[PDB]
Design an enzyme around this catalytic site. Structure first.
Site, PDB file in Angstrom:
ATOM      1  N   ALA A  76     -48.109  -8.941 -57.869  1.00 33.64           N
ATOM      2  CA  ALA A  76     -47.908  -7.956 -56.783  1.00 33.64           C
ATOM      3  C   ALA A  76     -48.305  -6.560 -57.249  1.00 33.64           C
ATOM      4  O   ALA A  76     -47.818  -6.061 -58.273  1.00 33.64           O
ATOM      5  CB  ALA A  76     -46.468  -7.943 -56.344  1.00 33.64           C
ATOM      6  N   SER A 105     -47.045  -8.064 -52.576  1.00 33.76           N
ATOM      7  CA  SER A 105     -46.067  -6.979 -52.639  1.00 33.76           C
ATOM      8  C   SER A 105     -45.305  -6.762 -51.347  1.00 33.76           C
ATOM      9  O   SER A 105     -45.921  -6.736 -50.275  1.00 33.76           O
ATOM     10  CB  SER A 105     -46.804  -5.676 -52.982  1.00 33.76           C
ATOM     11  OG  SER A 105     -45.936  -4.539 -52.970  1.00 33.76           O
ATOM     12  N   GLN A 127     -43.327 -11.138 -53.155  1.00 35.30           N
ATOM     13  CA  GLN A 127     -42.491 -10.285 -54.035  1.00 35.30           C
ATOM     14  C   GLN A 127     -41.569  -9.484 -53.105  1.00 35.30           C
ATOM     15  O   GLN A 127     -42.026  -8.850 -52.140  1.00 35.30           O
ATOM     16  CB  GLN A 127     -43.347  -9.356 -54.869  1.00 35.30           C
ATOM     17  CG  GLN A 127     -42.564  -8.364 -55.722  1.00 35.30           C
ATOM     18  CD  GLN A 127     -42.201  -7.098 -54.933  1.00 35.30           C
ATOM     19  OE1 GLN A 127     -43.055  -6.490 -54.285  1.00 35.30           O
ATOM     20  NE2 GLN A 127     -40.946  -6.665 -55.051  1.00 35.30           N
ATOM     21  N   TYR A 129     -38.312  -6.752 -52.668  1.00 34.81           N
ATOM     22  CA  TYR A 129     -37.329  -5.741 -53.042  1.00 34.81           C
ATOM     23  C   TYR A 129     -36.111  -5.880 -52.131  1.00 34.81           C
ATOM     24  O   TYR A 129     -36.262  -6.181 -50.944  1.00 34.81           O
ATOM     25  CB  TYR A 129     -37.933  -4.328 -52.878  1.00 34.81           C
ATOM     26  CG  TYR A 129     -38.918  -3.889 -53.958  1.00 34.81           C
ATOM     27  CD1 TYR A 129     -38.466  -3.745 -55.261  1.00 34.81           C
ATOM     28  CD2 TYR A 129     -40.264  -3.640 -53.707  1.00 34.81           C
ATOM     29  CE1 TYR A 129     -39.299  -3.348 -56.244  1.00 34.81           C
ATOM     30  CE2 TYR A 129     -41.120  -3.227 -54.717  1.00 34.81           C
ATOM     31  CZ  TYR A 129     -40.600  -3.080 -55.992  1.00 34.81           C
ATOM     32  OH  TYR A 129     -41.356  -2.678 -57.066  1.00 34.81           O
ATOM     33  N   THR A 155     -37.737  -8.685 -57.462  1.00 35.59           N
ATOM     34  CA  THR A 155     -37.877  -7.676 -58.522  1.00 35.59           C
ATOM     35  C   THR A 155     -36.523  -7.116 -58.857  1.00 35.59           C
ATOM     36  O   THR A 155     -35.810  -6.652 -57.954  1.00 35.59           O
ATOM     37  CB  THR A 155     -38.888  -6.620 -58.118  1.00 35.59           C
ATOM     38  OG1 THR A 155     -40.148  -7.273 -57.865  1.00 35.59           O
ATOM     39  CG2 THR A 155     -39.053  -5.578 -59.221  1.00 35.59           C
ATOM     40  N   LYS A 233     -37.970 -11.444 -61.386  1.00 32.16           N
ATOM     41  CA  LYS A 233     -39.118 -10.686 -61.931  1.00 32.16           C
ATOM     42  C   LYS A 233     -38.614  -9.391 -62.563  1.00 32.16           C
ATOM     43  O   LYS A 233     -37.992  -8.545 -61.896  1.00 32.16           O
ATOM     44  CB  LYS A 233     -40.111 -10.376 -60.823  1.00 32.16           C
ATOM     45  CG  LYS A 233     -41.260  -9.464 -61.249  1.00 32.16           C
ATOM     46  CD  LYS A 233     -42.252  -9.269 -60.125  1.00 32.16           C
ATOM     47  CE  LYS A 233     -43.482  -8.484 -60.513  1.00 32.16           C
ATOM     48  NZ  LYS A 233     -43.191  -7.058 -60.608  1.00 32.16           N
ATOM     49  N   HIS A 257     -42.733  -4.472 -65.614  1.00 32.95           N
ATOM     50  CA  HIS A 257     -43.247  -3.805 -64.432  1.00 32.95           C
ATOM     51  C   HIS A 257     -44.559  -3.064 -64.740  1.00 32.95           C
ATOM     52  O   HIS A 257     -44.778  -1.939 -64.275  1.00 32.95           O
ATOM     53  CB  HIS A 257     -42.171  -2.899 -63.795  1.00 32.95           C
ATOM     54  CG  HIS A 257     -42.310  -2.662 -62.321  1.00 32.95           C
ATOM     55  ND1 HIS A 257     -41.305  -2.980 -61.426  1.00 32.95           N
ATOM     56  CD2 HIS A 257     -43.269  -2.032 -61.601  1.00 32.95           C
ATOM     57  CE1 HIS A 257     -41.679  -2.593 -60.213  1.00 32.95           C
ATOM     58  NE2 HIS A 257     -42.859  -2.003 -60.284  1.00 32.95           N
ATOM     59  N   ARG A 260     -44.191   0.531 -66.075  1.00 37.27           N
ATOM     60  CA  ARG A 260     -44.022   1.621 -65.091  1.00 37.27           C
ATOM     61  C   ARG A 260     -42.572   2.007 -64.807  1.00 37.27           C
ATOM     62  O   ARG A 260     -42.346   2.922 -63.984  1.00 37.27           O
ATOM     63  CB  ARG A 260     -44.719   1.216 -63.772  1.00 37.27           C
ATOM     64  CG  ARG A 260     -46.220   1.043 -63.939  1.00 37.27           C
ATOM     65  CD  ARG A 260     -46.871   0.210 -62.863  1.00 37.27           C
ATOM     66  NE  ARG A 260     -46.944   0.807 -61.542  1.00 37.27           N
ATOM     67  CZ  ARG A 260     -47.911   1.609 -61.126  1.00 37.27           C
ATOM     68  NH1 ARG A 260     -48.804   2.097 -61.966  1.00 37.27           N
ATOM     69  NH2 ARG A 260     -47.995   1.906 -59.831  1.00 37.27           N
ATOM     70  N   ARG A 292     -55.620  -8.968 -70.129  1.00 40.32           N
ATOM     71  CA  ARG A 292     -56.976  -8.473 -69.875  1.00 40.32           C
ATOM     72  C   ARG A 292     -58.058  -9.443 -70.288  1.00 40.32           C
ATOM     73  O   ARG A 292     -59.208  -9.277 -69.859  1.00 40.32           O
ATOM     74  CB  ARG A 292     -57.209  -7.148 -70.598  1.00 40.32           C
ATOM     75  CG  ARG A 292     -56.188  -6.048 -70.322  1.00 40.32           C
ATOM     76  CD  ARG A 292     -56.260  -5.485 -68.933  1.00 40.32           C
ATOM     77  NE  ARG A 292     -55.213  -4.476 -68.704  1.00 40.32           N
ATOM     78  CZ  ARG A 292     -54.054  -4.664 -68.085  1.00 40.32           C
ATOM     79  NH1 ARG A 292     -53.720  -5.849 -67.576  1.00 40.32           N
ATOM     80  NH2 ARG A 292     -53.238  -3.642 -67.905  1.00 40.32           N
ATOM     81  N   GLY A 311     -52.032  -7.734 -62.865  1.00 42.30           N
ATOM     82  CA  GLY A 311     -51.816  -6.653 -61.921  1.00 42.30           C
ATOM     83  C   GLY A 311     -53.041  -5.787 -61.787  1.00 42.30           C
ATOM     84  O   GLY A 311     -53.873  -6.013 -60.901  1.00 42.30           O
TER      85      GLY A 311
HETATM   86  C1  LIG Z   1     -50.495  -0.181 -59.143  1.00 45.43           C
HETATM   87  C2  LIG Z   1     -49.333  -1.108 -59.334  1.00 45.43           C
HETATM   88  C3  LIG Z   1     -48.536  -1.392 -58.239  1.00 45.43           C
HETATM   89  C4  LIG Z   1     -47.460  -2.281 -58.405  1.00 45.43           C
HETATM   90  N1  LIG Z   1     -46.676  -2.606 -57.346  1.00 45.43           N
HETATM   91  C5  LIG Z   1     -45.672  -3.482 -57.507  1.00 45.43           C
HETATM   92  C6  LIG Z   1     -44.841  -3.899 -56.378  1.00 45.43           C
HETATM   93  O1  LIG Z   1     -45.088  -3.492 -55.256  1.00 45.43           O
HETATM   94  N2  LIG Z   1     -43.873  -4.775 -56.605  1.00 45.43           N
HETATM   95  C7  LIG Z   1     -43.538  -5.251 -57.831  1.00 45.43           C
HETATM   96  O2  LIG Z   1     -42.574  -6.024 -58.014  1.00 45.43           O
HETATM   97  N3  LIG Z   1     -44.260  -4.924 -58.934  1.00 45.43           N
HETATM   98  C8  LIG Z   1     -45.300  -4.074 -58.780  1.00 45.43           C
HETATM   99  N4  LIG Z   1     -46.078  -3.738 -59.887  1.00 45.43           N
HETATM  100  C9  LIG Z   1     -45.836  -4.433 -61.162  1.00 45.43           C
HETATM  101  C10 LIG Z   1     -46.813  -5.662 -61.208  1.00 45.43           C
HETATM  102  O3  LIG Z   1     -46.331  -6.733 -60.351  1.00 45.43           O
HETATM  103  C11 LIG Z   1     -46.976  -6.277 -62.590  1.00 45.43           C
HETATM  104  O4  LIG Z   1     -45.662  -6.462 -63.163  1.00 45.43           O
HETATM  105  C12 LIG Z   1     -47.843  -5.445 -63.536  1.00 45.43           C
HETATM  106  O5  LIG Z   1     -48.951  -4.903 -62.802  1.00 45.43           O
HETATM  107  C13 LIG Z   1     -48.372  -6.319 -64.643  1.00 45.43           C
HETATM  108  O6  LIG Z   1     -49.061  -5.585 -65.658  1.00 45.43           O
HETATM  109  P1  LIG Z   1     -50.667  -5.345 -65.652  1.00 45.43           P
HETATM  110  O7  LIG Z   1     -51.003  -4.306 -64.617  1.00 45.43           O
HETATM  111  O8  LIG Z   1     -50.849  -4.841 -67.051  1.00 45.43           O
HETATM  112  O9  LIG Z   1     -51.399  -6.630 -65.391  1.00 45.43           O
HETATM  113  C14 LIG Z   1     -47.161  -2.867 -59.730  1.00 45.43           C
HETATM  114  C15 LIG Z   1     -47.993  -2.567 -60.808  1.00 45.43           C
HETATM  115  C16 LIG Z   1     -49.050  -1.685 -60.652  1.00 45.43           C
HETATM  116  C17 LIG Z   1     -49.968  -1.337 -61.815  1.00 45.43           C
END
Ligand SMILES: Cc1cc2nc3c(=O)[nH]c(=O)nc-3n(C[C@H](O)[C@H](O)[C@H](O)COP(=O)(O)O)c2cc1C
Ligand SMILES: O=C(CC1CCCCC1)Nc1cccnc1
Length: 359
Positions: A76, A105, A127, A129, A155, A233, A257, A260, A292, A311
């Site tokens: 997501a 998402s 996914q 919330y 999440t 998650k 996440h 983030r 990657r 992601g």
């Molecule tokens: C731009 C972005 C938006 C994301 N949005 C969501 C989200 O809406 N819901 C969620 O549970 N996780 C979200 N995530 C976390 C991702 O599901 C995932 O855990 C993460 O992108 C995995 O790492 P990677 O970007 O290194 O592949 C987001 C991540 C990124 C980078």
């Protein structure tokens, strides 16, 4: 031109508006975990077997009982129409072509129904919330059920949004023509015309909409709400993983996440073995964060993950060429994974064993 996932990121930086690229790229705070999600994979070394007969490498596996063409699925990522006009519709179409799954998402720029209509034959999961409004939350789950989604990924690491410094600097918000399409009111749709304060618009949206009180009691509520498989998650501790199993959940997605949320947590590949041990085979364990390359996928499976989720690479595919760009990114990962299996002596995913890696 673009032959590896890093090339797609570099191209994306060259074509996307700064605020959008920064939203997608960023980690929390000083971005220590963001760097470690990648660096940690490099510390796990591979010990390949030779002379095993790898003429016929089978990448297929299963996620929660559903067959996939490879152990590499789309995670997501919110607001995909910022990257490409077709956003989540392009992503789901590519997943259908590949034979892999898409985790949608709750903060998508396309609705649950729109995504199902674009990818009726694609394996799709929602996914979720937990919104302060439980009626909103229930409606999302019910729509996922009605529209043929096969699991809920709840999440659990976002009671508040992490502090992504560039989003504060840029005062991140959606472009004018876009909305979070699963919601009806101006606030819940993250309308860029609503007052979300002076800092990151998304952090303020979360504070208004998402429930910081949630607890294991809310997991009990969700478990009783739907019969669909549920994956937790964002778990990083073995004790929490055991609690998820006790609540009747069906999987753990080991995730920080995408680095983030809380900065300074370990890389997901480094916490994966603790979590696999803690659940004692009772549920599938997945990983995301820093995938990657095909060798990253191999390492995660050797340490006991059933599959991994990607992601950011997907968003960079969209930024290049929409559906075709997502298809290209997934095909690169699939080919790199095939080659890594072959060079390591693995005919299929069932023989990717723990002796293949050491740290
Ligand atoms: C731009 C972005 C938006 C994301 N949005 C969501 C989200 O809406 N819901 C969620 O549970 N996780 C979200 N995530 C976390 C991702 O599901 C995932 O855990 C993460 O992108 C995995 O790492 P990677 O970007 O290194 O592949 C987001 C991540 C990124 C980078
Ligand atoms: O409600 C259930 C079963 C669910 C129901 C739907 C399908 C899978 C399992 N278990 C539960 C709930 C609260 C505390 N402990 C256990």
């Amino acid at each position: 031109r673009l032959i590896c996932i890093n090339d797609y990121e570099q191209h994306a930086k060259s074509v996307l508006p700064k605020s959008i690229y920064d939203y997608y790229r960023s980690g929390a705070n000083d971005e220590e975990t963001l760097a470690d999600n990648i660096a940690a994979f490099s510390r796990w070394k591979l010990y390949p077997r030779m002379l095993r007969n790898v003429a016929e490498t089978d990448l297929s596996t299963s996620v929660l009982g559903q067959r996939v063409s490879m152990p590499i699925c789309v995670g997501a990522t919110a607001m995909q129409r910022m990257a490409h006009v077709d956003g989540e519709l392009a992503t789901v179409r590519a997943c259908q072509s590949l034979g892999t799954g898409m985790m949608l998402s709750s903060w998508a720029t396309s609705s649950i129904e729109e995504v199902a209509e674009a990818g009726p034959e694609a394996l799709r999961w929602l996914q979720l919330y937990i919104y302060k409004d439980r009626e909103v939350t229930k409606k999302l789950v019910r729509q996922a059920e009605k529209m043929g989604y096969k699991a809920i990924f709840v999440t659990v690491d976002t009671p508040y949004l992490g502090n992504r410094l560039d989003d504060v600097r840029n005062r991140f918000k959606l472009p004018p023509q876009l909305r979070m399409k699963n919601f009806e009111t101006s606030t819940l749709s993250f309308s860029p015309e609503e007052n979300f304060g002076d800092d990151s618009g998304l952090a303020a949206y979360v504070a208004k909409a998402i429930d910081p009180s949630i607890s294991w009691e809310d997991i009990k509520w969700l478990r009783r709400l739907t019969s669909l498989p549920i994956v937790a998650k964002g778990i990083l501790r073995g004790d929490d993983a055991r609690e998820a199993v006790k609540h009747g959940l069906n999987g753990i997605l080991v995730s920080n996440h995408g680095a983030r949320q809380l900065d300074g947590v370990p890389a997901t590949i480094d916490v994966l073995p603790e979590i696999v041990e803690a659940v004692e085979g009772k549920v599938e364990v997945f990983l995301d964060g820093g995938v990657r390359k095909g060798t990253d996928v191999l390492k995660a499976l050797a340490l006991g993950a059933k599959a991994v989720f990607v992601g950011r690479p997907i968003v960079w595919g969209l930024a290049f060429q929409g559906e075709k760009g997502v298809q290209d990114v997934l095909e690169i990962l699939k080919e790199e994974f095939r080659l890594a299996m072959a060079l390591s002596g693995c005919q299929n995913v069932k023989v990717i064993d723990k002796t293949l890696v050491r740290k």
